[PDB]
Each structure stands twice: as C-alpha cells, then as structure tokens.
Amino acid sequence: MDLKVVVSLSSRLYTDEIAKMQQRIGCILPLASTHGTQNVQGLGLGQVYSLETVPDYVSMYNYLSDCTLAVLDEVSVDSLILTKIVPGQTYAIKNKYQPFFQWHGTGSLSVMPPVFGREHATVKLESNDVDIVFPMVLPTPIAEEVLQKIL
Amino acid sequence: NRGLYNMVNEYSQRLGGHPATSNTEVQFVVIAGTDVFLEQPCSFLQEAF
Amino acid sequence: MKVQGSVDRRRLQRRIAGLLPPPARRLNISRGSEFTRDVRGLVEEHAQASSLSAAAVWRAGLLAPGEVAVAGGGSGGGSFSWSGWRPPVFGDFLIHASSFNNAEATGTPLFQFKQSDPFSGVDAVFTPLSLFILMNGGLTRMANLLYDSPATLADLVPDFGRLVADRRFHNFITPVGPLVENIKSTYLNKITTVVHGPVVSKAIPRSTVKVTVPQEAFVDLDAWLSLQPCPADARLYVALTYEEAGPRFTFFQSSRGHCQIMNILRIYYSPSIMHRYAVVQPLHIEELTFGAVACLGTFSATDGWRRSAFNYRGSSLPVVEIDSFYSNVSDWEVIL
Amino acid sequence: MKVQGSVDRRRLQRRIAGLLPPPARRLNISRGSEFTRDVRGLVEEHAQASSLSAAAVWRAG
Amino acid sequence: PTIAHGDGRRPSKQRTFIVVKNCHKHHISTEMELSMLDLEILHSIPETPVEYAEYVGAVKTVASALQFGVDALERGLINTVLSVKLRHAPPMFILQTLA
Amino acid sequence: PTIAHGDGRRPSKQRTFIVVKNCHKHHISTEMELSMLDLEILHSIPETP
Amino acid sequence: MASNEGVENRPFPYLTVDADLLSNLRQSAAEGLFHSFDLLVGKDAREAGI
Amino acid sequence: EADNQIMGPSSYASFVVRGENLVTAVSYGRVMRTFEHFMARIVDSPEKAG
Amino acid sequence: EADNQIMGPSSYASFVVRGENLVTAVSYGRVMRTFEHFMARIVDSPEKAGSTKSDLPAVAAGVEDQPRVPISAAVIKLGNHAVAVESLQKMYNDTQSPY
Numbered sequence: 001m002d003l004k005v006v007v008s009l010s011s012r013l014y015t016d017e018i019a020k021m022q023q024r025i026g027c028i029l030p031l032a033s034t035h036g037t038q039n040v041q042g043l044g045l046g047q048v049y050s051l052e053t054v055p056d057y058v059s060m061y062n063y064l065s066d067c068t069l070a071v072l073d074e075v076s077v078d079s080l081i082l083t084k085i086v087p088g089q090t091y092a093i094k095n096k097y098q099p100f101f102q103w104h105g106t107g108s109l110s111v112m113p114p115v116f117g118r119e120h121a122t123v124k125l126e127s128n129d130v131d132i133v134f135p136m137v138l139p140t141p142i143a144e145e146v147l148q149k150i151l
Numbered sequence: 152n153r154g155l156y157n158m159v160n161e162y163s164q165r166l167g168g169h170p171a172t173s174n175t176e177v178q179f180v181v182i183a184g185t186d187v188f189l190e191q192p193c194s195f196l197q198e199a200f
Numbered sequence: 201m202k203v204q205g206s207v208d209r210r211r212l213q214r215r216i217a218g219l220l221p222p223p224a225r226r227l228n229i230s231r232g233s234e235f236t237r238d239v240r241g242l243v244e245e246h247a248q249a250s251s252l253s254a255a256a257v258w259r260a261g262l263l264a265p266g267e268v269a270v271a272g273g274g275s276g277g278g279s280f281s282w283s284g285w286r287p288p289v290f291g292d293f294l295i296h297a298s299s300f301n302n303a304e305a306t307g308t309p310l311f312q313f314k315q316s317d318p319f320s321g322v323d324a325v326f327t328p329l330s331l332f333i334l335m336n337g338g339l340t341r342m343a344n345l346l347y348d349s350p351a352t353l354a355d356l357v358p359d360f361g362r363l364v365a366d367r368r369f370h371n372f373i374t375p376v377g378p379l380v381e382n383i384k385s386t387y388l389n390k391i392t393t394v395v396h397g398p399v400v401s402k403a404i405p406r407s408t409v410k411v412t413v414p415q416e417a418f419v420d421l422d423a424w425l426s427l428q429p430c431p432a433d434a435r436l437y438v439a440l441t442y443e444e445a446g447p448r449f450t451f452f453q454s455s456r457g458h459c460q461i462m463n464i465l466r467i468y469y470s471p472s473i474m475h476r477y478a479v480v481q482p483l484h485i486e487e488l489t490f491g492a493v494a495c496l497g498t499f500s501a502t503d504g505w506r507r508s509a510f511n512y513r514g515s516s517l518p519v520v521e522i523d524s525f526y527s528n529v530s531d532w533e534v535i536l
Numbered sequence: 537m538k539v540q541g542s543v544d545r546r547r548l549q550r551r552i553a554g555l556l557p558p559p560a561r562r563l564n565i566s567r568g569s570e571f572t573r574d575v576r577g578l579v580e581e582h583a584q585a586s587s588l589s590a591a592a593v594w595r596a597g
Numbered sequence: 598p599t600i601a602h603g604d605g606r607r608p609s610k611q612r613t614f615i616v617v618k619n620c621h622k623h624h625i626s627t628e629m630e631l632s633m634l635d636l637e638i639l640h641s642i643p644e645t646p647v648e649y650a651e652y653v654g655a656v657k658t659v660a661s662a663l664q665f666g667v668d669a670l671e672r673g674l675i676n677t678v679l680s681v682k683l684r685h686a687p688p689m690f691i692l693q694t695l696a
Numbered sequence: 697p698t699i700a701h702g703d704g705r706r707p708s709k710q711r712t713f714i715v716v717k718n719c720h721k722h723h724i725s726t727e728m729e730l731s732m733l734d735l736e737i738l739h740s741i742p743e744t745p
Numbered sequence: 746m747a748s749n750e751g752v753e754n755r756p757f758p759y760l761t762v763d764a765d766l767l768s769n770l771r772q773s774a775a776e777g778l779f780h781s782f783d784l785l786v787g788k789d790a791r792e793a794g795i
Numbered sequence: 796e797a798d799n800q801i802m803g804p805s806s807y808a809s810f811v812v813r814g815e816n817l818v819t820a821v822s823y824g825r826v827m828r829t830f831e832h833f834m835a836r837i838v839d840s841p842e843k844a845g
Numbered sequence: 846e847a848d849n850q851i852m853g854p855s856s857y858a859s860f861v862v863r864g865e866n867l868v869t870a871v872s873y874g875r876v877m878r879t880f881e882h883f884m885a886r887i888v889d890s891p892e893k894a895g896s897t898k899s900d901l902p903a904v905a906a907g908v909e910d911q912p913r914v915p916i917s918a919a920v921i922k923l924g925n926h927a928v929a930v931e932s933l934q935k936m937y938n939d940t941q942s943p944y
Contacts, residue, residue, distance in 0.1 A: 001280060008723050037725040078721055088286050106291055106312060106374060154777035159691060164684040186943055202805040222735050294605060383605055390605030537916050538855035541674050544667020552663060558636050610787040614770055617751045617781045756821055758886035760904050761895040795820050815865050818887045825873050834868050
C-alpha cells in the first residue's frame with residue numbers, strides 16, 4: 001500500500017524558506033486530495049484561514065473533520081513529500097508547534113484549529129505566493145481548558 | 152567554568168593570566184613570551200600554600 | 201525503430217506481476233483428496249518468531265517491509281491485504297515494586313493514574329483490586345491478602361480526598377489494557393500491557409491470553425435486560441460511580457450499541473441515583489456529577505466470559521475470563 | 537633521519553642564484569678595447585615601451 | 598556494543614559515535630645578511646691573483662651563509678615539533694588519576 | 697569585447713559575466729482499477745471450458 | 746553543547762583499525778573533549794543513502 | 796508544403812554515474828557530467844587551445 | 846641500555862595530488878586522500894568485507910617499505926616495553942639558546 005504523496009512546486013524555494021519548513025518536518029498537514037501527485041494550493045489551511053476574509057472557528061472545524069491528514073517527511077528545493085494518515089497504521093510524529101505544550105505517553109492527542117496567532121501556525125512561501133498553515137495538536141485535556149477559557 | 156577536558160587542554164596549551172617576569176630585578180608582567188617556559192599549578196586549584 | 205516512449209514495456213509487467221496476486225480464499229474441495237498441498241497453504245498463518253540465526257530469520261520472514269511477517273522471504277510476498285491482521289501496540293510502564301503484587305492473572309485490565317509531578321520517571325498503575333483497596337467473602341478478603349498496608353497505595357494518589365469530592369477522579373485515570381508481560385524486580389518492576397491491539401502473549405511457546413475480571417464486579421447488562429439481531433461483536437465497559445457509600449467500579453458486557461447502552465445504564469443506576477440524591481447530597485455546584493463510562497474493547501459474542509477461580513494464598517476468588525479480546529479504549533462519558 | 541624537510545641544497549642551488557646578482561657598478565675602462573658589449577650593460581637605460589604584439593612584448597620586458 | 602539485562606532498565610539500541618579532528622599549521626623563517634662588496638666581487642671576474650683570492654673568499658662566504666640558513670631551518674623544524682609535543686603534554690598529577 | 701575611442705571616456709576594462717540556470721522537476725501519475733473477480737480468476741487454474 | 750561543526754555522516758569506505766578507540770567515548774562526550782562530535786543512536790546508525 | 800517530412804533521432808541519450816562519478820557522489824555530494832571529459836581537458840591534454 | 850641503537854626510516858613518505866584528485870580539486874573544493882583506495886573499495890570491488898589485515902596496506906601510507914637505518918639513542922626496558930631516551934640540550938646550547 002502506497003501512502004506517499006509528492007507535492008510539486010511551481011517555482012523553486014528560497015534557501016531561507018527551506019530552513020523554515022525543515023524545522024517543521026514532523027507534523028500533520030491536512031490534504032485536499034488523496035491522490036499520489038498534488039498541487040501546493042491544496043495542503044495549507046490558507047483556503048479556510050486566509051488573510052483576505054475573516055476566519056471562523058466553526059468553519060475550520062468542519063474542514064479538519066472531513067479532510068485527509070498527512071505527515072511531512074522530506075523537503076526539497078522544488079518538492080514536498082508526505083505520507084497519508086489512514087486507519088490500522090502506526091505513525092511517529094514530532095511536536096513542532098510554536099506555542100509549546102508538553103505531551104504525555106498513553107494520552108489522547110487532539111487536532112484543533114489554530115486559535116493562537118497566525119504567525120505561530122503559518123510558514124509563508126513567497127516564491128509560490130502561498131502560505132501553508134498547520135493545525136495545532138494538543139493533548140485533549142489541555143485543549144479543553146484552552147477552548148473554554150478563550151471562549 | 153567550561154568543561155574539565157577543556158580546562159586540562161588550556162592548562163598547558165595556553166598561557167595563564169599575567170604571569171611574572173624572570174631574571175629581572177623585580178617582577179613585571181610579560182606580554183610577549185619568547186624565552187617564557189613557565190607553568191603555574193595554583194591557577195587550577197585557586198589555593199595558595 | 202524508436203525507443204518506445206519513456207516507459208518501457210516488459211519492465212512494468214515484471215513490477216506489476218508482483219502486485220497483482222491477491223491472497224487465497226475459496227479453494228475447491230474434494231472428499232477424495234481431503235487434505236492437500238493446496239489446502240495447507242490456504243490455512244497456514246505464518247507465525248512471527250524465530251530461533252535467532254541470520255539464515256533462520258530469512259526463513260520466518262521477520263525482515264519484511266510490511267508490518268506483519270510474510271513467510272518464505274520474497275516468496276508469497278506482496279499480498280499485503282490479508283485479513284487485515286494488525287499487530288498489537290504494546291506499552292511499557294515502570295512501577296514501584298511494592299505497589300504491584302507480582303501474583304496477577306496475566307490478562308487483568310490495568311489503569312494508570314496520571315501523576316502531577318513533572319519530569320518523573322516512575323508511574324502509578326492499578327489493577328481492579330488495587331483500585332478497590334485505594335478507593336476503599338468477596339474482594340474484601342482477597343484484595344486485602346494481595347495488598348496489605350493500604351497506605352503505600354494512598355501515597356501514590358495524594359488528592360484522592362479532593363478528587364472524589366469534586367467528582368473529577370475519573371479523568372485522571374486512563375485505561376491501558378490487559379497485562380501481557382511482567383518482569384519481577386526488587387525495586388522497580390517493568391510491566392508490559394497491550395493498548396489497542398489483539399491481546400496476544402509474547403512468550404516463546406504461545407498460550408492464549410484471556411482478560412479476567414472478578415465476578416463480583418462483572419455485570420452482564422444483556423441478561424439483566426432480559427425480534428432482535430444477533431451481531432458479531434460484543435463490548436466490555438467500565439463505570440466509575442460516585443455514590444453515597446463511596447466511589448465504585450463495575451464492568452459491563454452487551455452488544456446493543458452506544459446510544460442504547462447509555463440509556464440502559466441510566467435505567468440500571470436509577471435506584472442508586474435516587475438514594476444518593478435524597479439521603480446525603482441533594483445539590484451543589486461541582487458535586488452534581490454521578491459517574492462516567494468508558495469502553496475497554498470488543499470481543500466475540502455467543503462465547504467468551506466463562507467463569508473460573510483465581511487461586512492464591514490458600515483462598516479462591518470467582519473470576520470471569522474473556523476470549524479473543526481486542527483492546528480499544530475510548531474516553532469517559534458522563535452518565536446522569 | 538635522512539636529508540631534511542626543507543633541504544638547503546635544493547633551494548640554495550636554484551632560488552638563491554636569481555636573487556643574488558646586484559646591479560653592476562664601477563666597471564673599469566680599458567683604453568685598448570675602449571668599448572665592449574660589457575660597457576653597454578652598464579650604460580643601457582632599459583626604457584619601457586613596446587610594439588603591440590605577443591612576441592615583442594616579451595622581448596621588451 | 599551493549600549487554601542484555603534481566604532488569605527493567607530500558608535498553609540502549611545500536612550506537613555509533615562520529616568524531617572529526619582538524620589540522621594545525623606552523624611557520625618558520627630566518628634572516629641572513631650579505632655584503633654588497635661581497636656580492637659585487639662575486640659577480641665580477643678577477644684580473645689579478647689578489648683579486649682571485651678575494652674571489653674565493655667571497656664564494657666561501659656566500660656558501661657558508663646559505664648553509665647557515667639551511668641549518669637554521671633544520672633546528673627550527675625539530676624545535677617546532679618539540680614545542681607541539683610540549684603544548685599537548687598534560688601534567689602528570691592530572692593524568693595519573695584522570696587515566 | 698570593447699571599442700577603442702579617442703574621446704574622454706573612462707576605459708571599460710575586460711568584462712565577463714557568469715550566469716547560472718537551475719533544473720525544474722515534474723511528476724506525473726495515473727490510476728487504473730481492476731476488479732477482484734479479474735484479479736482472482738487469473739491465478740486459479742480453470743477446469744471447465 | 747557545540748555538537749558538530751564539520752561532522753559529515755556520508756557513507757565512506759571506512760578503514761578498520763585494531764587499536765581500541767572505544768575506551769574514552771561516553772566519558773569524553775559527556776563532559777566534552779572533542780570540538781565536533783556526533784552521536785547517532787538506533788536507526789540513524791545505518792549508512793545514509795547516497 | 797515544401798518537403799512534408801523530416802528526419803530525426805529515434806533513441807534517447809543515456810546518462811549514468813558509473814565510476815569516479817560514483818565515488819565522488821559518495822565521498823563528495825557533487826557529481827560531474829562527463830567526468831572523463833573534464834579529466835581529458837585538465838590533466839590528459841592540458842595547455843591546449845579550446 | 847638493552848639495545849643502544851634503534852632502527853627507523855631514512856626518508857619521508859610522500860603525498861602527490863595528481864590525477865582524479867586534481868580533477869576534483871579544480872571542479873570542487875575537495876581533495877581525496879587515497880582516491881585509488883576509495884575507488885577500489887567503492888566501484889572496483891564492492892560487497893567485500895572489512896579486515897585489518899586487508900586494510901593494513903591502505904592505512905600504511907607511511908614508513909611502509911621505506912629504507913632502514915640505525916639511529917643512535919639509548920633504549921631502556923620497563924616491563925614489556927622498550928622505550929628510547931634522548932636530550933637535545935646540546936643542539937640548543939651549541940646555538941646558545943635556552944633548552
């Protein structure tokens with residue numbers, strides 16, 4: 001079973017933006033299409049969390065529930081390689097999320113939309129004129145306190 | 152303050168701080184060490200006898 | 201001629217030849233033959249062990265890309281879709297050796313209390329009997345034999361007075377799953393359970409593992425309730441119940457469904473809700489909650505949960521045992 | 537223990553020879569000869585000018 | 598490599614270390630003086646036996662100067678080796694117990 | 697190259713440009729289906745016509 | 746600390762030396778004796794693909 | 796139409812890393828196109844006008 | 846002194862940077878040492894094990910098969926060891942510089 005997804009870029013990335021995205025090599029990105037070759041306009045949340053219109057919490061929630069998640073594995077000058085998350089498989093993730101929360105073994109992790117600043121969730125790719133945005137992954141007991149307090 | 156082996160290396164391979172002059176009437180501090188063939192074991196311990 | 205495109209025929213055929221064949225099912229049967237080389241291959245299931253030799257490892261097929269071993273090395277390799285057998289995910293815990301009694305049934309479901317000291321290195325893990333003595337014939341005589349000086353368990357949970365009062369004790373306890381392996385060490389034991397997977401023994405000569413629950417606590421929700429369907433699966437549940445007498449722990453079995461079960465548990469606990477709500481505690485802010493429920497896994501209906509004794513220290517305890525368990529933990533749902 | 541890392545004979549033999557000759561001075565005049573190609577070596581002024589050609593530029597110095 | 602233990606201690610898997618060392622460079626030089634009279638009478642030719650004796654004196658002097666320089670190079674090479682060793686020799690009252 | 701001029705211009709020295717071009721990569725993929733009946737009956741020997 | 750400056754884990758044809766270098770490793774790595782050193786544990790011990 | 800047909804190659808032009816290119820790809824990350832030609836122009840036939 | 850003399854090489858072992866080394870030095874910033882050995886173990890003979898006897902010649906780019914001479918020093922034996930002992934104070938004095 002093939003889980004690899006190759007994201008090809010229209011234009012080569014700057015030597016700086018490679019350093020930015022490599023720092024986030026192990027983390028979950030939601031994927032528009034489940035097919036093997038893909039575009040760059042798909043993976044970010046820039047569609048739902050965008051600079052031009054007002055963002056909604058209940059709109060990003062509806063998206064992450066339907067969407068297909070993925071894990072970053074390697075970044076090239078002109079490429080992005082991911083592996084889909086599907087049932088009946090065990091994955092190894094890392095936590096690289098700018099507001100830092102400690103994780104615990106044998107716990108329950110939750111994938112919730114970024115309720116902190118944009119700057120913490122985003123990596124701007126000026127070369128392709130898009131920003132890729134990551135969902136935040138909290139331990140569920142932490143995610144509940146954060147929700148009801150900002151609410 | 153740095154590592155133990157770093158200190159051991161710097162002991163011999165780097166001149167200590169402001170050592171005294173030799174074969175002079177009084178002892179000045181030496182900036183340029185040509186003859187200088189000295190070594191000071193109390194700078195390590197920080198103890199005087 | 202021109203080199204056929206970029207793609208090369210007779211080179212993709214070889215590569216796709218490996219991917220094509222699906223696993224074997226629906227073999228034809230002849231009473232004359234009645235046991236064949238064909239019938240064997242369909243039945244053999246390729247155990248995953250070895251004798252520790254570089255040549256013997258290739259024989260068994262441990263060094264294979266898929267998550268499960270395919271025997272014969274490359275031969276018969278590339279099916280990758282066969283009964284969706286998923287290996288178990290084991291968990292490793294480091295325990296105070298005086299906290300865990302070594303004489304445990306090898307299959308008993310475990311529970312981990314989430315400590316509140318940062319950067320620790322040891323964990324607190326409880327059996328159904330440890331939880332009995334902590335929460336304070338039957339379990340009373342047997343649990344006290346296994347665990348004397350209940351103080352050492354009270355030392356692990358220092359807020360237990362506070363937690364059961366605010367009715368938030370359950371969310372710091374996370375179910376982990378049945379025992380699989382236990383190393384017996386003087387100071388810090390090493391316990392291995394199986395979380396989210398077919399509970400299977402890792403010993404060298406294989407033996408079937410069956411999760412065991414004391415019969416005093418286990419309550420068949422399906423018989424107490426007694427056209428209806430007969431489905432394949434049945435599920436095991438736990439209910440932590442804050443009563444007037446004190447917190448309590450019970451296990452349940454039924455194959456109805458989640459929305460139904462949450463209704464049957466409210467009917468089952470109606471006598472005990474009225475009592476607490478009238479005798480001792482009418483009302484307060486935090487003290488409103490009654491209890492929680494979680495699901496511990498799915499086992500086969502129509503079988504499982506035989507009854508047996510647990511013999512230790514010249515005294516027995518009637519215990520039920522479930523076969524072919526598949527550990528699968530969900531979070532706690534408040535019943536009230 | 538054989539020869540040396542920086543051998544004196546090898547360096548002194550070739551490199552030293554070019555640096556040694558200093559500009560000539562006080563050549564003695566012989567009335568009998570009255571002029572030689574040697575006296576030209578002392579007098580010559582060695583002016584710096586050329587013809588724009590690869591072979592002439594090298595000749596010019 | 599490791600040992601396999603019967604205790605609970607979590608095991609170290611296969612481990613490898615990778616170390617990198619670098620060069621250090623050194624320089625050596627010496628100066629010599631040669632007299633202009635010496636050089637000029639060397640590059641001239643003698644016309645009388647007194648000037649020929651002076652000539653052989655000049656050639657001996659220049660050869661001795663070059664030999665002096667070469668010997669200085671050799672002494673300096675041995676000197677720099679010994680000084681590198683001395684730099685990297687830690688003291689004995691440290692090394693005896695640290696070893 | 698350059699041109700030599702009698703005017704007052706400041707002389708343009710010998711000039712050379714060094715230029716660099718980089719590769720671009722493209723990926724391509726298709727999907728095909730095969731039914732389980734087809735994938736099965738291919739491997740079992742057929743007896744009847 | 747200053748982990749690795751010129752360490753390169755490219756696959757090389759490594760020369761096998763009988764001298765035992767494995768006598769001052771975790772002690773030297775712990776405090777610090779090497780300018781640039783890298784520790785590769787577990788799966789990372791393999792040779793990297795070219 | 797003038798000629799209504801043309802001529803052209805039928806096979807591709809293959810490129811592989813075989814020898815010193817392989818050893819440089821291992822030891823050194825970089826790889827050279829026509830390593831043999833670079834050798835021929837640097838060491839084999841130097842001081843020759845291109 | 847158990848020996849009163851030792852035996853050692855009489856000329857230094859060379860390093861020459863001509864060939865594929867030259868090509869890689871011109872094209873890329875790097876120079877390989879024993880490019881021949883790298884190539885022999887990579888492309889000319891892969892899938893070949895590692896042995897110290899097998900690799901001894903390769904690591905022996907030095908004194909291996911260089912002429913032998915006697916060198917005058919005093920040797921002393923401590924236990925299993927045989928160690929030389931020297932003093933260059935004469936080399937420093939006959940130049941009138943501190944030892």
